[PDB]
Design a protein around this ligand. Structure first.
Ligand SMILES: N#CC1=C(N)Oc2[nH]c(=O)[nH]c(=O)c2[C@H]1c1ccc(Cl)cc1
Lengths: 424, 424, 317
């Protein structure tokens, strides 16, 4: 009559068994799904923690091929403004160049040149590009009289490949070129030198319009309705309804409201740890579920409430419940090493959320502080350098595990390899 | 016969500064001092000639902070001289080694060069003399046909202040300017925007030609003459004849040889720890001496049983050099900014730091992540940017000078007093 | 031009009190002393103007035991005046209570030298503060000397304390500025930040003796601030010359000190973490118990005798 549901296993209870392998670790595919509608080139998402994910680290996550969830320990307007920073991050073209209008007085243009130099001011009339003003133009009353007019401009259409533009610069013997839309409205500016140095991120997570992807977290408190609406107006790709107990009337209804009110935004629900919670979130319309309740030993949930589910079994039970639905599941918590990340994938996660592991990187919030001959971030977290090096080690280990199991892609890794149970 | 004990010698922990009447705030005291007969420093900091501490990149940062670095000698002659050159030739905004063409270069070849460097301009040189530029506009046979001629060139003579160049760029309504010398040989290329965005270092240690100062270490082995001559030709400001036992025929003669052979370069000898050694190096021609033999529980003491506690060594050397105009550099034994203050009051003109600068961003080595922490690899903790440590060390010195009522380094060295304390 | 050592300077662990012929029981000696020219105390104990030690509640306890508290200044002007007013208006019977002419419990308050100091002093004086403690890291300075002169001239009916100092010359300079007492202690402890960051300090036994000799015959008391770990050190500070001793951290965590009691891993702490230490009176009782035993050992019937007659031995490691 002691109601024991099952024996539940954690990461240290299992090991992956090697299997026949034909694909080298460097050649396997890591592509996966965050939600019904969002694909990621690596199975990594950064946690909505105020020591982990603000705009800077979310941009870096998306560039690596995963995604960041911006934390909610801030005001509604600030959270939306963080989303905007990610959506607006552009790698090559310059979007807000300093312009003037035909009516601008040359006296005023010369004042702006004390800060900006003489490389050239675009001339705009209500967003229409009508010419450019160069220092050479000032060298041979309003800029309408001296500007180079529209029929001498060399421009590139918005959306032209960055390598087609470099070629047009060369053909025209120019270094700068203005970018316009179909109607000759100014849309930005590219430089030959800036295309050359333009670091590129071929794995970047991008939406259908080419902008970096980003998520944002919300609770179930009173202003959630207004926070979700601001995040959606900002272009957020995914809203994470994120509480300690996702299997609750509060979370289920908030997920339903988001899915009914903002049908075209992805919604994740959690956290959960059972098949039946997974089903309740799927039926409320969740586009993905986040798995993890007291996943680690000695941890407030276990010590204070005696509640928790070992994370291997929690992941496997959720994956079993969702097989066929099309709803991914994100493993949240208990990963301390890359080996644990590989086990979470074989147990059925579609990808993995990391938190404190990313805290203290250069891209995470906080300022670098020198303490007692050591580096910390303060707001005392040790300073960890660039996020790319951590991502590289994690994905390096996952690739290694896919080599040992003969898994050529994530779908195989999630469904084919086997564990052994060990004793310690 | 009896036990030949010369004196009781005090180290840093034996003494404390007595507070005195003060009416100058720490932020307002002057830290200006002298490294040698002929080199002034804005802060009394010198980075040590260690191969985990001082190569070009850290030497540049030390000089910009107002101190100086001694480039280490654990490298070949030509490699050390190249490190000197990188410091002597470092510039904020002026691009050096620009891609050039000649008046005879064929326009076909220039177009091939533009594929990689783009347009915006190739200086035209004729055996190093500047005779024109080729811009994209000039292209819309040979470069001499199309090149903009010498008389259309806006040039500034090298060594002009940056704000001076920035003004000339403004006056002529251009973005690029060429830097020339007395005979119009090309020296570099500077742009308005590179100047507007360059960091200024108002405290920088510079020579009479405006170049960052640097020193370099030599020993007494057989290739020392060749090494010294290569360092002098590279522009080194000071040669440090740097051995474990400065009070020796080999160091004394090598200091003398440097002073007689290279009259125009400053020479430091060391290390020493007695009045007698101080007089011997000053008589040999040294422009400063370096103090420190076995300053605290180290290899010299354990292996050879040799050393002089550093407070007494500094004061003994200081008394021996009083009235000679030869400064002394305290080297070794400084754990804390408080020890640096004590060294100054005992008579040092400045302090050499070693391993405290190891592991900074600018120090040699690469950053690695190990166990959620950051180190420098070549096993040292990553300490962040040099300026943080420098700021801490000088902040403590400033506080000591506030406590002693010292308004400048000269007062700090000659007026304040110590108490001798017990082990208790 | 040799190394400029003014003297060897001794701390508490360098010295011990020598027993002397004795005729008084510890239970019978007198502990009365002065805090300032105009303020007597029945025990020579002062609580520190630290935000972990002295707000109104602990100043109230201190004055009831016969000492006094200095309210800290890490708070607003009106707030700190409110704290002073709480003490002056409080009636709990307590036979040793430190009280002013009106029968109100005595209290002090700290101020600095920054910009708003003039308004802070004015507000504290109007709340009834008994003594203004002009309290900086470096009392031998233009700022402190001029502020104590300003207080003595603008508010001649309050007592003024200046510090901290550690030399004879600084003591005489504060006295000439009008100080009613000086506070002694610059870098008193082995690992002061002062010592580590600036290399500055004076071991406290020598600092106290030097300041006491400089103020002899002036009527200006001196308060030993810092370095007291045990009641034995308190005894030594009195024999070196102090009139009373100021405790800080040792009072932190008492029931009366600021902060909120919290339970962490089966232990109690004050949540601002320091351990919970129970009632202040037990600590004050142990300290005065140790001092009474020292006076019994040395033969001192009262504080004047304890400050002037007994001798130290110097000891080694
Ligand atoms: N000196 C000069 C210049 C002259 N004469 O022409 C122009 N015409 C412009 O329109 N902008 C310019 O910035 C310049 C500068 C220039 C200097 C060096 C290079 Cl490599 C390229 C250009």
């Amino acid at each position: 009559m002691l109601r024991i549901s099952q024996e539940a296993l954690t990461f240290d209870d299992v090991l992956l068994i090697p299997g026949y392998s034909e694909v080298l670790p460097k050649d396997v595919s890591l592509k996966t799904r965050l939600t019904r509608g969002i694909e990621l080139n690596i199975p990594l998402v950064s946690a909505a923690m105020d020591t982990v994910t603000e705009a800077r680290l979310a941009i870096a996550m998306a560039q690596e091929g995963g995604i960041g969830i911006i934390h909610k320990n801030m005001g509604i307007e600030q959270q939306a403004a963080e989303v905007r920073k990610v959506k607006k991050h552009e790698t090559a073209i310059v979007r807000d160049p300093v312009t003037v209008t035909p009516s601008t007085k040359i006296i005023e243009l010369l004042q702006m040149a004390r800060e900006y130099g003489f490389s050239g001011f675009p001339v705009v009339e209500q967003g229409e590009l009508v010419g450019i003003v160069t220092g050479r133009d000032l060298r041979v009353d309003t800029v309408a009289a001296i500007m180079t007019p529209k029929d001498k401009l060399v421009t590139a259409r918005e959306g032209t490949p960055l390598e087609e533009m470099k070629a047009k610069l060369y053909e025209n013997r120019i270094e700068k070129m203005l970018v316009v839309d179909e109607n000759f409205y100014l849309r930005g500016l590219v430089t030959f030198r800036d295309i050359e140095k333009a670091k590129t991120y071929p794995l970047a997570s991008k939406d259908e319009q080419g902008r970096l992807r980003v998520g944002a977290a919300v609770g179930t408190g009173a202003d959630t309705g207004e926070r979700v609406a601001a995040l959606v107006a900002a272009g957020v790709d995914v809203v994470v309804v994120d509480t300690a107990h996702g299997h609750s009337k509060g979370v289920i209804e908030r997920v339903r409201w988001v899915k009914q009110t903002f049908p075209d935004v992805q919604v994740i629900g959690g956290n959960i740890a059972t098949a039946e919670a997974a089903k309740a979130l799927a039926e409320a319309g969740a586009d993905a579920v986040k798995v993890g309740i007291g996943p680690g030993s000695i941890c407030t949930t276990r010590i204070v409430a005696g509640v928790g589910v070992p994370q291997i079994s929690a992941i496997a039970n959720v994956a079993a419940a969702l097989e066929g639905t099309g709803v991914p599941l994100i493993a949240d918590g208990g990963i301390r090493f890359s080996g644990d990340l590989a086990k979470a994938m074989v147990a059925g996660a579609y990808c993995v959320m990391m938190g404190s592991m990313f805290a203290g990187t250069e891209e995470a919030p906080g300022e670098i502080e020198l303490f007692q001959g050591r580096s910390y971030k303060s707001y005392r977290v040790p300073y960890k350098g660039a996020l790319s090096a951590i991502v590289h080690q994690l994905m390096g280990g996952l690739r290694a595990a896919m080599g040992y199991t003969g898994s050529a892609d994530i779908q195989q890794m999630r469904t084919q390899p086997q564990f052994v149970r060990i004793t310690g």
